[PDB]
Amino acid sequence: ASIPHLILELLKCEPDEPQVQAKIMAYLQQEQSNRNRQEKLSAFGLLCKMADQTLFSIVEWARSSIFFRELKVDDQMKLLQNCWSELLILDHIYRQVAHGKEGTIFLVTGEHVDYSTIISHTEVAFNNLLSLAQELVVRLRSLQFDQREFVCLKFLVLFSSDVKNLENLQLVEGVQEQVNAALLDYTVCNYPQQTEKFGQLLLRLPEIRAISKQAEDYLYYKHVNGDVPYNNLLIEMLHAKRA
């Protein structure tokens, strides 16, 4: 169907959206449901909670992915610690492009939560991030960003050659060339009228990066003052470097 082998292989590693939104969703009910009122059920904090869950999901996806599954645990940890927030942001973005609308945010659980709302129960420093993310959503919606392209970017974000002290550097650099070539082949063959979808798609990664940077600083700032419950995974990841 004019779809390069590599990409079809990358699509088989994708999780099944519904079963993921269900699991996570459940986990949250199983949460509140317990401490019915005494604790902290504020807005923002609920986000961190799902972000932490969206994270286990990313780890799961990577763990079962075609080339990543051949790396030793040390390298897998290095690659994941280097892009965990980018994968989150990318994920959130592709979800809005594929299942979002006007001014409504489609959460990982499957719940739409009017953009308007979210912006009224959160601080501006958070509001600004979300909005930075929503700008990309608009661009990517105009570029006809599809799932096949979405999986290619996940691998381009995960298999970064700019990570140092990797045991098997050649493999990471191999995957990287394997995917770029695939994404190029695909976008020109499937969207030939769009002169530079390829170039345009790649321009998004440094933007996704710069956003995950502000994201992490905000999170870190909110954590240094009990404004974040606890997410052994969110916080752990957050303390891989920290400066």
Partner: peptide, 11 residues
């Protein structure tokens, strides 16, 4: 460092 939770998840 020796990423604890991530390790439990990756091994």
């Amino acid at each position: 460092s020796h990423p604890t939770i991530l390790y439990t998840l990756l091994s």
